[PDB]
Scaffold this active site. Sequence first.
Site, short mmCIF file in Angstrom:
data_model
loop_
_atom_site.label_atom_id
_atom_site.label_comp_id
_atom_site.label_asym_id
_atom_site.label_seq_id
_atom_site.Cartn_x
_atom_site.Cartn_y
_atom_site.Cartn_z
N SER A 1 13.28 2.98 4.03
CA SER A 1 12.88 3.83 2.92
C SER A 1 14.02 4.00 1.93
CB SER A 1 12.36 5.19 3.44
OG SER A 1 11.81 5.93 2.38
N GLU B 1 1.73 2.44 4.19
CA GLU B 1 2.89 3.13 3.63
C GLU B 1 2.50 4.41 2.90
OE1 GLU B 1 6.24 0.29 4.35
OE2 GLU B 1 5.98 2.46 3.94
N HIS C 1 4.41 5.21 6.87
CA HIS C 1 5.81 5.18 6.50
C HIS C 1 6.67 5.75 7.62
CE1 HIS C 1 8.91 4.92 3.35
NE2 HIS C 1 9.30 6.15 3.64
#
Length: 527
Positions: free
Chosen positions: A196, A323, A436
């Site tokens: 990330s 995501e 995510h």
Amino acid sequence: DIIIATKNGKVRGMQLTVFGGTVTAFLGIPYAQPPLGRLRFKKPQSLTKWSDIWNATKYANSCCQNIDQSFPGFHGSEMWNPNTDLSEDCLYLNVWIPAPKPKNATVLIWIYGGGFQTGTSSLHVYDGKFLARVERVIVVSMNYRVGALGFLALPGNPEAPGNMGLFDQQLALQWVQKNIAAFGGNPKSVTLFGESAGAASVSLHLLSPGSHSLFTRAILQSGSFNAPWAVTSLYEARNRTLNLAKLTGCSRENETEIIKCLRNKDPQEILLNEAFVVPYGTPLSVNFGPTVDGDFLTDMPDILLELGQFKKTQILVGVNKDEGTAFLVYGAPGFSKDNNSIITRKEFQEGLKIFFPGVSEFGKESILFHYTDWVDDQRPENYREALGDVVGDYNFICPALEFTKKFSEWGNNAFFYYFEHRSSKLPWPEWMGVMHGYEIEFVFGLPLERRDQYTKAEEILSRSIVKRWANFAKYGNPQETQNQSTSWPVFKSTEQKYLTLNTESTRIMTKLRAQQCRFWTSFFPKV
Ligand SMILES: *[C@@H]1O[C@H](CO[C@@H]2O[C@@H](C)[C@@H](O)[C@@H](O)[C@@H]2O)[C@@H](O[C@@H]2O[C@H](CO)[C@@H](O)[C@H](O)[C@H]2NC(C)=O)[C@H](O)[C@H]1NC(C)=O
Ligand SMILES: *[C@@H]1O[C@H](CO[C@@H]2O[C@@H](C)[C@@H](O)[C@@H](O)[C@@H]2O)[C@@H](O[C@@H]2O[C@H](CO)[C@@H](O)[C@H](O)[C@H]2NC(C)=O)[C@H](O)[C@H]1NC(C)=O
Ligand SMILES: *[C@@H]1O[C@H](CO[C@@H]2O[C@@H](C)[C@@H](O)[C@@H](O)[C@@H]2O)[C@@H](O[C@@H]2O[C@H](CO)[C@@H](O)[C@H](O)[C@H]2NC(C)=O)[C@H](O)[C@H]1NC(C)=O
Ligand SMILES: O=C(CC(c1ccccc1)c1ccccc1)NC[C@@H](O)CNCC1CCCCC1
Ligand SMILES: *[C@@H]1O[C@H](CO)[C@@H](O)[C@H](O)[C@H]1NC(C)=O
Ligand SMILES: *[C@@H]1O[C@H](CO)[C@@H](O)[C@H](O)[C@H]1NC(C)=O
Ligand SMILES: *[C@@H]1O[C@H](CO)[C@@H](O)[C@H](O)[C@H]1NC(C)=O
Ligand SMILES: [Cl-]
Ligand code: NA
């Protein structure tokens, strides 16, 4: 007992029992003068040597940050909140080394995510002992300043130049270079990896000339600098700074005078005001992030990428199936982690207003039109799923694909992955899919622990991913060569081959999100 002599003083570790063997762990080694007082907002300074033995036997403070609070008592969000005291004194790193001391081990350095506002290296899902035990690599992770204390920018003014957290990371890379040999690691075999905002950090190190010599290879999980959330323009960095200075009673004329005012405020005074430096936010808002400072970043990074101005080496890049869904429960209407979040067409249209606040009415109809070509018109999850895909394709997948094309076009080997396994222990509801952040536990080998109630299929998959990641670090080729695995082909611009990771069957596919990504990368910028 194990004590290692580093270039700054002796450190004492502790020995962990992992899988019937041993790992030596050094938690909380200082690597920079604490950025306190007049050092607030400056680049990290070198450490003063010590004569005693530093007892690196517990995780250090986490850098100041706002804690997530949307779901009190919910492991799904609380596993990400810091697990040590918050302090400005937080520039520490951790080292896991195999037992017995390896001769010349490859070093993996972890850079955590958290949207450049949050994060810490002491999280359970970043525990490096399994990688050390299973693959005989050394794992290093560091804390870096986040939010305003890490990325506040009045550019040119060295009192607050911006990119401080990035420079924190860099200084820890310098520490590994100067000292990892004493721990038995090979400073010439060093692979950054992060997820990330950490993966965007890794990507910016490929551009920073200061970092060129500090690592060998790079793994980007669910993040790159060309993502819309990853870099703050110098215009916004200054409006965001003046706004924060207004919010704290720190507006002065001499720009240097503002910074000394901000340096007298308490950390919580600043932290409480960070949210309001942007007038209208989104769930993907990064209020204080990387900027073109002319030091860590010498030019706008997208120009550097397009003109081949980055470290030439191999990269491992990849994204997760779902995501975007995490962000849907942090603001989109009709979404909830406690129901199936079936939303209508009207609720989807307000969802776009949330995530694309300053986009034309015509822009929003284009997104709608692109993402509502129903396979099955009758499916009532259609708008729910379409909204997550919009946010995921736009914010993570398409930028990572475009980064991997441009990077590989200068001749280096790139490998792309599509992680599509939903952890059997994932605490968020099933409609949120392969979210995510939830490949990390597989990369760090948590399912290798049989006592943790991951499935057997998950042990195999994590064991294979751990081997692919280690093989990439050691040799720049992410194969699993022994267990008739699928061979992982290089990502080339003119075919764009990628590997899917899952439990059932790892396959090779091509041109991931081809049509979605033409829309976001080529057309949508024109609106
Ligand atoms: C530890 O190993 C290095 C070599 O590391 C390899 O080469 C790197 C470029 C990178 O590709 C890594 O992933 C590799 O594992 C040894 O470095 C050499 O040392 C000799 C000493 O005379 C020197 O002449 C060479 O130029 C060095 N570099 C290379 C590439 O050979 C180093 O000596 C080893 N040290 C220990 C303590 O084992
Ligand atoms: C640049 O900043 C100004 C000022 O932001 C306001 O003051 C800050 C201290 C903080 O409280 C922000 O949330 C405030 O909005 C922005 O100008 C404001 O814009 C809003 C838009 O709704 C408007 O209602 C206010 O009246 C404006 N106030 C002033 C003093 O101009 C401006 O939009 C920012 N520029 C951007 C974000 O591009
Ligand atoms: C799914 O839930 C959202 C959120 O509602 C909250 O969570 C529910 C599980 C339940 O505990 C509610 O009482 C909570 O309010 C629902 O959206 C809300 O709808 C109400 C009434 O229409 C509205 O006043 C709220 O503002 C809405 N809040 C949000 C965040 O959307 C939604 O209706 C539920 N959907 C389904 C399919 O059940
Ligand atoms: O994690 C961040 C920033 C991050 C993000 C924010 C909200 C939802 C999901 C992720 C982010 C912001 C902007 C760009 C990239 C990532 N903040 C601290 C705090 O909210 C923790 N996170 C929320 C969880 C939700 C499920 C998995 C991911 C972490
Ligand atoms: C470090 O730890 C050892 C073992 O627990 C202890 O005996 C020693 O006093 C500690 N030293 C310092 C400086 O805290
Ligand atoms: C701002 O303050 C600094 C430090 O006191 C000083 O060097 C500089 O000249 C000042 N600038 C202005 C415009 O007053
Ligand atoms: C390969 O298979 C064996 C058992 O057949 C297993 O013990 C081993 O850990 C596997 N290795 C990898 C890297 O998947
Ligand atoms: Cl419809
Ligand atoms: Na697919």
